[PDB]
Amino acid sequence: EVQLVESGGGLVKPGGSLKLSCAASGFTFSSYAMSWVRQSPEKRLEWVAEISSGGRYIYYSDTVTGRFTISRDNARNILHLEMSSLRSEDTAMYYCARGEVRQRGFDYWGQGTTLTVSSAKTTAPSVYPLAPVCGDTTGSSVTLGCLVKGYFPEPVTLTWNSGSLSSGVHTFPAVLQSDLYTLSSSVTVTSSTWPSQSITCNVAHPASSTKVDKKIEPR
Amino acid sequence: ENVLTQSPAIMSTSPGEKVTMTCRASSSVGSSYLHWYQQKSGASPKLWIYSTSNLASGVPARFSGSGSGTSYSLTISSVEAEDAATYYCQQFSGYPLTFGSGTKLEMKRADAAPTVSIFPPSSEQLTSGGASVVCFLNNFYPKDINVKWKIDGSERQNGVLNSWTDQDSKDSTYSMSSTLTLTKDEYERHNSYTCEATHKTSTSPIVKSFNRN
Amino acid sequence: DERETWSGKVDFLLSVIGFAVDLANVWRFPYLCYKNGGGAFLVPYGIMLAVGGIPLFYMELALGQHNRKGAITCWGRLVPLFKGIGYAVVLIAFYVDFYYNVIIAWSLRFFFASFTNSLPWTSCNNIWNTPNCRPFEGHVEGFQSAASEYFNRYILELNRSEGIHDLGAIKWDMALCLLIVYLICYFSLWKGISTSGKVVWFTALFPYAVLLILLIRGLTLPGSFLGIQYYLTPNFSAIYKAEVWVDAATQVFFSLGPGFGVLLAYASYNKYHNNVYKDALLTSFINSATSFIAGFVIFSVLGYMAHTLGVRIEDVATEGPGLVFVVYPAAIATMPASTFWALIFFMMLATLGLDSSFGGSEAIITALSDEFPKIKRNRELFVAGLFSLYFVVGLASCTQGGFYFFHLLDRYAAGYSILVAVFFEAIAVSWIYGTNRFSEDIRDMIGFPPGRYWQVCWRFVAPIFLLFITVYGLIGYEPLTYADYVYPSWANALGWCIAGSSVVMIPAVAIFKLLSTPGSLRQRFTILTTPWRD
Ligand SMILES: CC(C)CCC[C@@H](C)[C@H]1CC[C@H]2[C@@H]3CC=C4C[C@@H](OC(=O)CCC(=O)O)CC[C@]4(C)[C@H]3CC[C@]12C
Ligand SMILES: CC(C)CCC[C@@H](C)[C@H]1CC[C@H]2[C@@H]3CC=C4C[C@@H](O)CC[C@]4(C)[C@H]3CC[C@]12C
Ligand SMILES: OC[C@H]1O[C@H](O[C@H]2[C@H](O)[C@@H](O)[C@@H](O)O[C@@H]2CO)[C@H](O)[C@@H](O)[C@@H]1O
Ligand SMILES: *[C@@H]1O[C@H](CO)[C@@H](O)[C@H](O)[C@H]1NC(C)=O
Ligand SMILES: CN[C@@H](C)Cc1ccccc1
Ligand SMILES: [Cl-]
Ligand code: NA
Ligand code: NA
């Protein structure tokens, strides 16, 4: 039925500017008011700005006031957020929501679009295999690993056998250290499953145009 | 600005029990202007309770809102595993609009010892000059756990990257990834490396080492 | 930024409840129920009230609070082409104060004469009585009642006047009452809603105190139930009648105060985030409820006369000043402790017109104050000059032929004038200004947009509802006549000028500043069709 899609956003240098767009469908857009709500990496929800149904009455938070401009296109049903002189504190995932009746709160939310403000340069991740020490053998089952280290910015796409294995798989969230993200993933398969078959760790890092699959051997 | 504070910050509960999370505002808020949102892990927030009482469409009757003035509360009659998420209270009473600090609801279960795995630096990494050791602690409860790195005889307190998985909706356990990064030249100067984690489950730590041999 | 504000909600509510509730709630509504066949009349009444009446009442209170300024500036900042509407609305209320205040004076006059025992209107034995006088109401015109001859041959002295051309001598006891009325209105609206909001605490609340007493005192009398039958006994045969739906539509519109700029003025002093939709619904209900309650008050006494006093219900059941100044007092005189019921009754009539007159004058003052800062800074002097103009011109209605002058303004002044005014108010807001644009204004104030039900009534129902009343009003038109006297054709024309004086302002101001601005339409047109966007 009702669907909201946030588009745009990505890495931006401090002081820079960017424009976010929200595509509204499934309802009359001119009727409902819209708002931008961002959630920081610390998971703190902060209301940014609200626009009227006709785009007349506008409200901003004291944080983004004067540095942000929220627009409205009722013809194509597109919501816009114009950012300028971006700071590091402005890094979060921005949400599109309505937003019409104050007493009903926010009806629907978009999937959100991520904005990262940093001076850090974009770098491709280095994928490393995790091969068990040799060896205690087995054992009921054996765990493998894939180390993705020194990349930026987020996100990264990590699966196993092209998403074939969803079982016994733990993908740990990235941890930013000195302007670099380090990520790792563990998969647990039976002793007869490996290395009898092929267990592959494939990582995808769109920012650097890095698509790399991998094979794990106990060499 | 109207500051909404929610407590407890994190909450563990066994399925079927009754949970209550509160909300407190700097200034008095209209009872019809206070709403609650449920945000599941890796998902967008969803309207849950509005006007302090009325539930939303799709929201089970187990949820109930209450409170007024500067104090509000969200209550779940009988908690279910699918009710585990972060809950945010928010007020439309006045601008700027503000969200509560949020209350993270986690499911409580039986204690389980972590399954630990240690991996040596990958040969692909050594050629780059760096050497990083990784240790996986999988499927344990509760969340808190402590990894300790030792090269040979002595412990190394720095150069460690820890990561924790969010609580899964299946076995409701946690997991940790501890990565110790070193230079290859400084890595090849020591022939032994040990990764051990002291959990609540055992009075003595689960330990696994490896040698360059 | 910025504007003076209310002393808190109860002041505003009582001002609106005060303005909305008047003698029309008493001498009119109950009569219509009787004429239209009882509680069945509530059906067309309630329907005409829901679709037509409230939405118009809601509308004015909404943009009244939203734009936060008088009728003149409000429509000037809304649809500058239609700014003339604000002018029309203001001078309509200006015409009304020339006459309507007289009713309050009559109330004070009867109040002064009711101090005594053996009330003067209870006997045909007096000096002003004709041989054709009767103890109570009848059929034949040549023979009137005792309470009727007192009002006509003593108070009004309308027998001296042969028509509107002869106003006779000025009656000073009546001029004294009118002056007393204008004084009360001056020390009320003196400092504005500061004092005004406090005074309505009495004028608005007092009538309900007396209503409760007369409601009990009425139902405590023999044949009181018989009157309630003639009042509420349903005939649903009238539901199919066209005139019934017209009377219900007419009463509902005139009972509420939309289009007078009074609601617009009162609401302009509201807090921007105050909830008007709650106030509009509340105030509306209290109004109709008061009429319904008062209905029991009148017909309980009316039925009492038919039973104990031996008079036909058709004769004693009437509308307008005749009911309150003649029929009802006649019944009170027969009851034990007559002097008490008479004193509180006439005081109720005065307090019923006072808060209604407050809003009328305030609509002029507030609309002008926002338009002209000169009379904004000088207040006490302005209202003094205004009420001075009222009193002087009002002396025409204090004459012996005063009623002939009063009845002329009653029919013509606000009757056909405001219907077209409010019709343009509805068309301007819903179409020129637009509904979607207006609905958004309310959402920013009360937090939520009006239901689509309200949007439909504003854009469609109201305009048809207004023309419905206007069309039938013109088709059922007749030359002005009172009793056996027929007004000269010049008198009729003099009233159309008064009725046209207001309405003509709309197209006039539309043309005036249409020639003032440069460019060429649509360019000149679109400038006047744009609201104030800064
Ligand atoms: C004669 C005395 C004793 C009673 C007077 C009758 C009115 C007080 C009642 C009768 C019909 C009622 C109306 C019936 C229909 C509704 C529709 C309703 O519209 C909506 O609310 C739609 C959704 C929403 O916005 O809530 C608003 C009130 C209203 C006009 C009611 C207003 C109050 C009314 C006029
Ligand atoms: C029906 C007869 C017999 C009794 C009527 C009682 C009168 C006094 C009742 C009816 C409706 C009532 C009002 C309803 C609305 C308000 C708004 C509130 O903020 C102040 C009190 C006030 C103004 C009430 C005063 C008392 C009131 C006017
Ligand atoms: O009998 C009572 C009372 O009636 C009249 O009084 C008039 C008075 O004359 C007027 O000047 C004005 O004050 O209204 C009064 C109403 O009673 C008569 O004057 C006389 O009978 C007496 O005063
Ligand atoms: C009635 O009594 C009042 C008491 O105030 C008095 O003024 C009046 O003269 C009396 N009526 C007469 C004597 O006709
Ligand atoms: C409430 N009914 C109005 C006719 C009363 C009024 C009085 C003075 C001015 C305008 C209107
Ligand atoms: Cl009425
Ligand atoms: Na009325
Ligand atoms: Na009144």
Side-chain angles (χ1 to χ4, degrees), chain C residues 14-23 25 100 203-204 207 348-358:
Chain C
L14 292 184
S15 292
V16 177
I17 295 296
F19 160 82
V21 174
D22 55 14
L23 306 110
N25 293 78
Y100 186 93
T203 67
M348 175 192 63
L349 298 181
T351 58
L352 271 176
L354 281 177
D355 30 9
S356 290
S357 180
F358 292 167

Side-chain angles (χ1 to χ4, degrees), chain C residues 29 42 45-46 49-50 54 277 281 285 288-289 292 450-451 453-454:
Chain C
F29 178 78
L42 300 184
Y45 175 82
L49 181 60
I54 295 184
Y277 174 75
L281 291 177
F285 170 74
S288 300
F292 192 75
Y453 167 79
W454 300 110

Side-chain angles (χ1 to χ4, degrees), chain C residues 173-186:
Chain C
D173 61 321
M174 203 64 281
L176 176 57
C177 290
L178 184 58
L179 189 63
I180 296 178
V181 170
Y182 282 145
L183 290 180
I184 305 178
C185 298
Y186 186 93

Side-chain angles (χ1 to χ4, degrees), chain C residues 296-363:
Chain C
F296 291 93
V297 183
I298 297 299
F299 276 88
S300 191
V301 179
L302 249 56
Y304 156 83
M305 292 185 300
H307 187 65
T308 190
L309 297 182
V311 58
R312 304 212 316 160
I313 187 62
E314 305 85 11
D315 302 331
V316 294
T318 175
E319 60 168 338
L323 175 56
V324 295
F325 295 138
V326 177
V327 178
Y328 199 87
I332 298 183
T334 66
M335 311 174 186
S338 305
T339 305
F340 177 70
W341 315 119
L343 284 173
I344 66 180
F345 181 80
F346 290 140
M347 189 60 179
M348 175 192 63
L349 298 181
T351 58
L352 271 176
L354 281 177
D355 30 9
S356 290
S357 180
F358 292 167
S361 301
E362 186 62 70

Side-chain angles (χ1 to χ4, degrees), chain B residues 9-21:
Chain B
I10 309 182
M11 187 189 308
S12 293
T13 298
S14 306
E17 287 194 345
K18 190 173 75 175
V19 304
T20 301
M21 58 195 65

Side-chain angles (χ1 to χ4, degrees), chain A residues 31 33 35 50-59 99-103, chain C residues 66 272-273 433 436-449 533:
Chain A
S31 297
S35 299
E50 176 183 82
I51 189 173
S52 309
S53 59
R56 293 184 295 163
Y57 312 91
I58 309 297
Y59 298 95
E100 178 57 18
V101 175
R102 286 195 178 108
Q103 294 74 11
Chain C
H66 173 51
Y272 185 82
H273 287 292
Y433 190 75
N436 65 334
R437 192 148 59 174
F438 180 73
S439 300
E440 170 176 331
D441 298 327
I442 300 180
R443 183 279 180 185
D444 189 79
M445 290 191 301
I446 67 179
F448 64 96
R533 297 306 169 185

